Design a protein around this ligand. Structure first.
Ligand SMILES: [Cl-]
Ligand SMILES: [Mg+2]
Ligand SMILES: [Mg+2]
Length: 428
C-alpha cells in the first residue's frame, strides 16, 4: 500500500488544514497570507506538489478532519501539543516557542497570579491548550469558572476583553502581539506557565514517511532563517513597533482612521491602488493627523513639500482630502516612473523609498547595489545599500551625494508593517 508521502506525490497535492485567521491563513482580494500558509506553501514546493488549504471552524473540527478517512495530510494551525500522547495524533518537531498569557482590560485591576483568576468572567477557545491549562488550575482552585467557545477565533476573544464583554482571556503570546494593534485596551496580565513549542499535526499510526519530510523541512526552514522572517512579519508587531507603539496604533485605528478612510478609499479607487498602502503611508508620515507640521518643509497628513503640493495641484496641505489625494497621486506617479526592470511587489517598496528619499538618491543606491554584485531590481538588496548614502565614505563618490538612507529603510519597513496590519483587519 502507498505510504502517506507516496499518496501526496501521486495526487500531486498536499492538503493542509488550518484556521481562517491572519495568524494562520487569510484571504484578501490581493492574495493569500499567513504564517502557516507561507510555511506550508514552502513545504509543498519542497515536495514538488500543489498546496491545497482547508479550514476548520474550531480545534475539535480540525482534529476530527485530520483523523477521518480521506482527510488532509497535516494540520498547520499554531497547534500546541497536548501534555499526554493520544494515538489519534502525532506532532512534528516544534517550530516556534510561545508563552501563554492572561489578557485583561486596561482600567480593571490586573490579576497577578493564577489564584487571582477566580471570580472572573473568562473565555477561551474550546479544545485549546489554554482550556486545558484552566481545567488543570480548576483542580487546584475549585471555585475557578471559565467558559469555552467553539465558534470564534482568538481575535474575537481579545475583542471581548477590549470592549468589556469578558474580564479575561488566555492566549498565546504571538497572538497577543499580532492583535495588540487592534485593541487599545487589551493588556498582558502575566505569563501563565512556561513557553510551549508549536507543532504541525499528522494523523495517527506508524507511517513516518511524511513526518520525516516535515521534520527535515522545518529544520531547513530554521536554518535558512525562514521561520524567523515569518515570525517577524506576522508576530513581530510589538517587537518592532514597541508595546506602547502597538496599542497606540490601535487607538489611532479606532479614533483617527475613520475620519479619513473614505478619502483613502476614493484615492485608491481613482488611482487603482490599494487604499491600505496609502493609509499606511499616512500613518508613518503623520499618524493620521492632517494638521501635523515639521521643521523640514513637510506638512499635512501625507507630509507633502510645497514643491510636491504645487506639482500635484494641492492648494492646501492642511486639508486632509487634498493631502491624501496629492500624496497618493505622487506615490503612484513615482511608482510608474521606476525602471521597467523593477517588478511588483518590489516595485511598490522601491516607490516607498523614493517617496521618502527621492528617485535620484534611490538610483544611486541601485547603482551601488549593482557595483557590489547585488540585484538592483530586488528591494532586499538595494535596502542594504541605502544606509551607506548617509556615510561620507560612500556618498562622496555618488552622483547625488548625501542622503538619509537609514531613515528611508525605517520608513519602508514601517509602512510595509502598517500595510499588513490594515490588510489583516477583521470584522466583529
Ligand atoms: Cl522593507
Ligand atoms: Mg469561524
Ligand atoms: Mg513506529
Amino acid at each position: 500500500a502507498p505510504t502517506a508521502l507516496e499518496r501526496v506525490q501521486k495526487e500531486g497535492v498536499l492538503r493542509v488544514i488550518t484556521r481562517n485567521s491572519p495568524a494562520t491563513y487569510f484571504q484578501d482580494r490581493n492574495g493569500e497570507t499567513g504564517f502557516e500558509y507561507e510555511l506550508a506553501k514552502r513545504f509543498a514546493e519542497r515536495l514538488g506538489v500543489e498546496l491545497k488549504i482547508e479550514t476548520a471552524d474550531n480545534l475539535d473540527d480540525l482534529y476530527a478532519q485530520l483523523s477521518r478517512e480521506g482527510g488532509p495530510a497535516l494540520a498547520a494551525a499554531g497547534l500546541t501539543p497536548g501534555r499526554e500522547d493520544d494515538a489519534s495524533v502525532r506532532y512534528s518537531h516544534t517550530y516556534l516557542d510561545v508563552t501563554p498569557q492572561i489578557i485583561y482590560r486596561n482600567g480593571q485591576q490586573r490579576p497577578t497570579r493564577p489564584e487571582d483568576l477566580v471570580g472572573k468572567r473568562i473565555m477561551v477557545l474550546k479544545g485549546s491548550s489554554h482550556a486545558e491549562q484552566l481545567a488543570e488550575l480548576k483542580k487546584q482552585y475549585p471555585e475557578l469558572k471559565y467558559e469555552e467557545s467553539d465558534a470564534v477565533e482568538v481575535v474575537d476573544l481579545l475583542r471581548m476583553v477590549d470592549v468589556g464583554d469578558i474580564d479575561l482571556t488566555l492566549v498565546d503570546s504571538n497572538e497577543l502581539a499580532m492583535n495588540q494593534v487592534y485593541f487599545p485596551n487589551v493588556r498582558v496580565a502575566f505569563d501563565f506557565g512556561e513557553a510551549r513549542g508549536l507543532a504541525w499535526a499528522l494523523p495517527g499510526g506508524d507511517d513516518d514517511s511524511l513526518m520525516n519530510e516535515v521534520n527535515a523541512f522545518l529544520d531547513q526552514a530554521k536554518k535558512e532563517g525562514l521561520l524567523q522572517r515569518l515570525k517577524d512579519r506576522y508576530y513581530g508587531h510589538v517587537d518592532v513597533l514597541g508595546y506602547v507603539g502597538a496599542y497606540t496604533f490601535a487607538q489611532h485605528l479606532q479614533q483617527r482612521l475613520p475620519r479619513y478612510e473614505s478619502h483613502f478609499k476614493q484615492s485608491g479607487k481613482q488611482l487603482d491602488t490599494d487604499w491600505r498602502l496609502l493609509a499606511a503611508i499616512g500613518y508613518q508620515e503623520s499618524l493620521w493627523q492632517p494638521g501635523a507640521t515639521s521643521k523640514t518643509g513637510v506638512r499635512g497628513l501625507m507630509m507633502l513639500t510645497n514643491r510636491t503640493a504645487q506639482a500635484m495641484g494641492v492648494s492646501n496641505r492642511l486639508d486632509p482630502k487634498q493631502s491624501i489625494q496629492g500624496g497618493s497621486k505622487y506615490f503612484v506617479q513615482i511608482r510608474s516612473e521606476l525602471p521597467e526592470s523593477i517588478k511588483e511587489p518590489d516595485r511598490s517598496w522601491f516607490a516607498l523609498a523614493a517617496y521618502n528619499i527621492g528617485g535620484a538618491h534611490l538610483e544611486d543606491a541601485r547603482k551601488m547595489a549593482e557595483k557590489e554584485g547585488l540585484n538592483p531590481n530586488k528591494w532586499l538588496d538595494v535596502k542594504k545599500m541605502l544606509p551607506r548614502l548617509a556615510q561620507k565614505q560612500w556618498y562622496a563618490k555618488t552622483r547625488y551625494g548625501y542622503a538619509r538612507g537609514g531613515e528611508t529603510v525605517h520608513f519602508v519597513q514601517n509602512v510595509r508593517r502598517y500595510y499588513d496590519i490594515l490588510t489583516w483587519v477583521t470584522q466583529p
